[PDB]
Amino acid sequence: RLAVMVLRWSDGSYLEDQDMWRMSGIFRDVSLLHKPTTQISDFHVATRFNDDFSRAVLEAEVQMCGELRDYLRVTVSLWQGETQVASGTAPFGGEIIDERGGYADRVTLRLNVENPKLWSAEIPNLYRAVVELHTADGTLIEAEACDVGFREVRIENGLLLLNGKPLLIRGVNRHEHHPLHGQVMDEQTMVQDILLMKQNNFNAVRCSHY
Amino acid sequence: PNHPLWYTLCDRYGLYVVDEANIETHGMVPMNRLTDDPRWLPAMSERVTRMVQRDRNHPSVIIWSLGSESGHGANHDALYRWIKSVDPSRPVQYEGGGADTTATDIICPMYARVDEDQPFPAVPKWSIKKWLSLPGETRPLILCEYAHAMGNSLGGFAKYWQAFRQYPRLQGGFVWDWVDQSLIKYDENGNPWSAYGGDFGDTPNDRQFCM
Ligand SMILES: O[C@@H]1[C@H](O)[C@@H](O)OC[C@@H]1O
Ligand SMILES: [Mg+2]
Numbered sequence: 026r027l028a029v030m031v032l033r034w035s036d037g038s039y040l041e042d043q044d045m046w047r048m049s050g051i052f053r054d055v056s057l058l059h060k061p062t063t064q065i066s067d068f069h070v071a072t073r074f075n076d077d078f079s080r081a082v083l084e085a086e087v088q089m090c091g092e093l094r095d096y097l098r099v100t101v102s103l104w105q106g107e108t109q110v111a112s113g114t115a116p117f118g119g120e121i122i123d124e125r126g127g128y129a130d131r132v133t134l135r136l137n138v139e140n141p142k143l144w145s146a147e148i149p150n151l152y153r154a155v156v157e158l159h160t161a162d163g164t165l166i167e168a169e170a171c172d173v174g175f176r177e178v179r180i181e182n183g184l185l186l187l188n189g190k191p192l193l194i195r196g197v198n199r200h201e202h203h204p205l206h207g208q209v210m211d212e213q214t215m216v217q218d219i220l221l222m223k224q225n226n227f228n229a230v231r232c233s234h235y
Numbered sequence: 236p237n238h239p240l241w242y243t244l245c246d247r248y249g250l251y252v253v254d255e256a257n258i259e260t261h262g263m264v265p266m267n268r269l270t271d272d273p274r275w276l277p278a279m280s281e282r283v284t285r286m287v288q289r290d291r292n293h294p295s296v297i298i299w300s301l302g303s304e305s306g307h308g309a310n311h312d313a314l315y316r317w318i319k320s321v322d323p324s325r326p327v328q329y330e331g332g333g334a335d336t337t338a339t340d341i342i343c344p345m346y347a348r349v350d351e352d353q354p355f356p357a358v359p360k361w362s363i364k365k366w367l368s369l370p371g372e373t374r375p376l377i378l379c380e381y382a383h384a385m386g387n388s389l390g391g392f393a394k395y396w397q398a399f400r401q402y403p404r405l406q407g408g409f410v411w412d413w414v415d416q417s418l419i420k421y422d423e424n425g426n427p428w429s430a431y432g433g434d435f436g437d438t439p440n441d442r443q444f445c446m
């Protein structure tokens with residue numbers, strides 16, 4: 026049995042003064058997750074490019090919790106549909122960081138990707154990154170994964186560039202609101218909102234204000 | 236460069252002066268044929284150097300100019316830098332080759348409009364409001380020539396002044412121009428009249444465009 030005591034008002038409310046209906050409750054999903062004792066505790070994906078975007082490097086930093094062991098490995102593999110385009114495997118133990126060494130509980134995988142299919146709102150090309158935590162000899166402990174979009178966001182010479190090209194933001198602010206269910210969001214409503222935005226030539230959304 | 240007395244009077248009555256080297260090669264194709272040619276650097280340099288040597292003590296002179304309508308060539312860049320070395324006390328401007336070249340401290344277009352772009356290839360005239368904020372641009376903008384006062388003209392003059400007052404980096408301009416270049420002729424009766432291009436048998440001519 027779970028027992029949850031939810032307070033409508035707290036000191037947190039001083040930072041939640043957005044112009045919107047003031048409600049309370051357990052309004053998003055509740056779930057139970059089972060992770061092994063030796064586990065992927067964090068992972069970050071970065072993508073950097075050469076000058077004309079014909080070459081990329083996927084850089085995945087993976088952090089573990091649990092007992093450190095020499096036999097431990099991480100494999101990060103990159104998938105375009107059912108085709109594996111890239112893969113890398115390494116033991117834990119990052120580069121030296123300071124006088125006291127490095128992160129023995131972290132590793133960074135670098136995967137080369139030639140002619141990557143770039144992500145944008147115009148063409149949302151996605152790859153799949155799978156992060157396997159495993160023993161050297163081949164026993165999977167667990168896997169985590171995410172969708173990876175190859176794109177560069179930078180500001181150069183006063184212009185916001187996506188993949189080297191200046192953006193023109195056709196955006197809208199969108200609160201999480203339903204006339205029946207209040208501030209509880211559902212897939213159908215979400216999908217509906219996105220289809221209408223894109224059908225009406227929006228390419229950007231702001232999470233106003235949370 | 237003007238008659239030496241002009242500067243004296245400007246010093247004493249109070250007017251800001253743009254002093255301008257005697258260099259215009261408008262009729263060349265392209266405009267910078269001579270000014271990009273190193274064989275014409277010596278003749279151009281004397282037109283800039285001797286002006287500065289003459290007028291550098293006049294307080295009314297606040298900006299040096301490299302000349303007029305001669306495109307943009309390497310000789311301008313050389314002479315730009317020459318003045319900067321010899322006289323750090325005054326900015327250098329030059330409108331040729333696009334009004335915003337490396338030979339000018341001031342964005343100094345001629346007849347760029349307030350709101351309307353004129354996107355000519357190679358040498359566009361941007362809306363002065365737009366020109367200011369082009370990626371990487373930081374210089375002030377003062378029109379070397381604007382509101383071409385030919386005949387019944389100066390329509391939309393107020394649109395410029397509204398923009399000047401609203402934008403800090405839009406710091407005004409020089410109207411084109413002060414006085415009609417008409418000449419006096421006399422008829423059979425000795426009655427004076429105002430003459431323009433062609434009235435002296437001069438041909439080819441450009442008619443009333445001198446006024
Ligand atoms: O309150 C809403 C928004 O959060 C604010 O920034 O602007 C006014 C709008 O209606
Ligand atoms: Mg508010």
Ligand code: NA
Pocket residue numbers: 398399400401402403404405406407
């Ligand atoms: Na101004």
Ligand code: NA
Pocket residue numbers: 444445446
């Ligand atoms: Na004229």
